[PDB]
Amino acid sequence: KQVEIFTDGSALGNPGPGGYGAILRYRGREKTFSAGYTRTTNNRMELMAAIVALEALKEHAEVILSTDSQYVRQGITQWIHNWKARGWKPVKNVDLWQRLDAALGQHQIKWEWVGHPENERADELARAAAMNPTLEDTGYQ
Template sequence: MIEVYIDGASAGDPGPSGAGIFIRGHGQGEHYSFPLGHMSNHEAEYCALLKALEICLSKKYKTVSFRTDSQLIERAVEKRFAKNDTYSPFLEKALEHIDQFDLFFIKWIPSKQNNVADELAKKGIQLNRK
């Protein structure tokens, strides 16, 4: 099973934002940092989820287990519902992707267990400035 650690970060809320993704599986680790432009921290979390789903689908991973330190993301995906209408388009797109996997799991983890994705997200913020 592929393990995917995701994190979104913003320097300000809203502010310059980045997404960090760490994928562990098949005996190797993949690291991704993406600049996201100017958005809120919650939007950055959703963008990290979407980018990670797109990567996994492009690599034809069929069974994935996502880890996030965002309870907002974990709850929205589990309930397939976003309380805030601002996030509904993000969630709808994510669910379209999720439904393409044979098995998909998402689990909330404490921030200290998500430090690799967090560092990658911070690097994504820096990439906005280049």
């Protein structure tokens, strides 16, 4: 019952137009997730990509999440546990981190920090979305 998730973000500014791209692969078949925002950051899009994808799952499963985000990696391996222990204090992009934390709750997540062409596919989706934003990142306050 393993499921592969590949994510990436893109941003043409900080803040600026941005987008996320996620590839959800299971049993040779895969689903795609991407959307662009008018004003956001790559960091937020990186998180958003994981969130949308994990929340697409309607049942517990072994998930292998692959991403080249240095932000997500640091957050997950060095900050997350401390933020939760301190009562999420709030912390920058707390809205997304808490959202992701929840999603990663009902799942057996195995992280793969970046060889898969799928990561490039996510990159392409995120960049395309950043160039054609249709949403607003209400969380970027």
